[PDB]
Design a protein around this ligand. Structure first.
Ligand SMILES: Nc1ncnc2c1ncn2[C@H]1C[C@H](O)[C@@H](COP(=O)(O)OP(=O)(O)OP(=O)(O)O)O1
Ligand SMILES: [Ca+2]
Ligand SMILES: [Ca+2]
Ligand SMILES: [Ca+2]
Length: 341
DNA sequence: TTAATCCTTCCCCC
DNA sequence: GGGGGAAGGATTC
């Protein structure tokens, strides 16, 4: 096994500089304006000009403007980026059938055959890096290692616009010196629970009796960390499948009044069906994000497909189920369609 | 402070 | 006991 991971640099922000180079060299911040008040919303992402100064992903637009009041702030255009990704996702296909598109900007390539070792592999990196830079004018970072997890870690270490190879020897000094919080699939909450167990390095998972671990962070997540620890992790590069689509919208003012919410709910359903594109779900779920930012949801599965008229009808009833079941106020509302026929 | 998949209960019933 | 499918909360990105 030899995995080659590609992960695009400051993607949205970069795609924006690609569509107006004049931006190149200036702090660019890509926002998601909630429109609940002048400059309300957060930062989807920003290029490095803006990051060394603090402006990172997730901070309020307002807070970001206090730091870099004179940086280009642009409204996110997912679609445009979504299309740019697709094109880049093809150049990559041409480099290996066994390909796994992990997200809008990540893809794992199994070049086990194509290449015969890390020398030739690392060269295929530059070859791929360079080709994407030429065809679409985008810089990316390449990680290469024994398995996907490490191939991804390799990338995290080489960015921005870089390439790195993690060889079995390094894999080992990592299975020992890598910070458990930097292991893919281990978010904050799990990284925390693993702290109270004394597990600070991938290795520590070997000293704890499975059941205690299986009881603290779920079974699968447990067996997963172990294999990574005993260098036995080796999952295949499979072409993932969209198992559910949905959209959510923030409202102008929080609310409880049904009629007051419906219009939004529907706006969500409209957008959601359009995305489906020929797909037909058997499952629908209404998702409400309350004023205290906690999430609540309710849904129903049908023994057949859902037509738009059905979605409308059934979603309103499920929203009523939420409002009833919850006394707080609703800050956001959306729907999710899944279980596609 | 702006999408999707995983994990653990339920509940039906051989 | 345990397959098998639903539902909803919990996490990760
Ligand atoms: N709060 C947020 N709101 C919206 N999008 C977000 C938020 N936080 C993160 N994102 C998105 C922003 C990006 O589009 C996507 C992350 O891109 P990501 O792959 O993690 O790194 P990147 O490689 O493109 O950035 P970097 O320059 O650090 O390498 O996550
Ligand atoms: Ca990326
Ligand atoms: Ca991390
Ligand atoms: Ca990502």
């Amino acid at each position: 096994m030899i995995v080659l991971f590609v992960d695009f640099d400051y993607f949205y922000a970069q795609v924006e500089e690609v569509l107006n180079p004049s931006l190149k060299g200036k702090p660019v911040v890509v926002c998601v304006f909630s429109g609940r008040f002048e400059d309300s919303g957060a930062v989807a992402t920003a290029n490095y000009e803006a990051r060394k100064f603090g402006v990172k992903a997730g901070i309020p637009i307002v807070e970001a403007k206090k730091i870099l009041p004179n940086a280009v702030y642009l409204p996110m255009r997912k679609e445009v980026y979504q299309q740019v990704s697709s094109r880049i996702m093809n150049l990559l296909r041409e480099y290996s059938e066994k390909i796994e598109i992990a997200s809008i900007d990540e893809a794992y390539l199994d070049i086990s055959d194509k290449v015969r070792d890390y020398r030739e592999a690392y060269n295929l990196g530059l070859e791929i890096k360079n080709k994407i830079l030429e065809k679409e004018k985008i810089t990316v970072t390449v990680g290469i290692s024994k398995n996907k997890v490490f191939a991804k870690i390799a990338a995290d270490m080489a960015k921005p616009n870089g390439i790195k190879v993690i060889d079995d020897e390094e894999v080992k000094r990592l299975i020992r010196e890598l910070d458990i919080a930097d292991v893919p699939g281990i978010g904050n909450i799990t990284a925390e629970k693993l702290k109270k167990l004394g597990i600070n390095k991938l290795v520590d998972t070997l000293s704890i009796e499975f059941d205690k671990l299986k009881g603290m962070i779920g079974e699968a997540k447990a067996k997963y960390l172990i294999s990574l620890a005993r260098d036995e992790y080796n999952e295949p590069i499979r072409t993932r499948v969209r198992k559910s689509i949905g959209r959510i919208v923030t409202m102008k003012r929080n609310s409880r009044n049904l009629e007051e919410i419906k219009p939004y709910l529907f706006r969500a359903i409209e957008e959601s069906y359009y995305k489906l594109d020929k797909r037909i779900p058997k499952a629908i779920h209404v998702v409400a994000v309350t004023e205290d930012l906690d999430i609540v949801s309710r849904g129903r599965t049908f023994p057949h497909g859902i037509s738009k008229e059905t979605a409308y009808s059934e979603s309103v009833k499920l929203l009523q189920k939420i409002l009833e079941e919850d006394e707080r106020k609703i800050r956001r509302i959306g729907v999710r369609f899944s279980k596609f026929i």
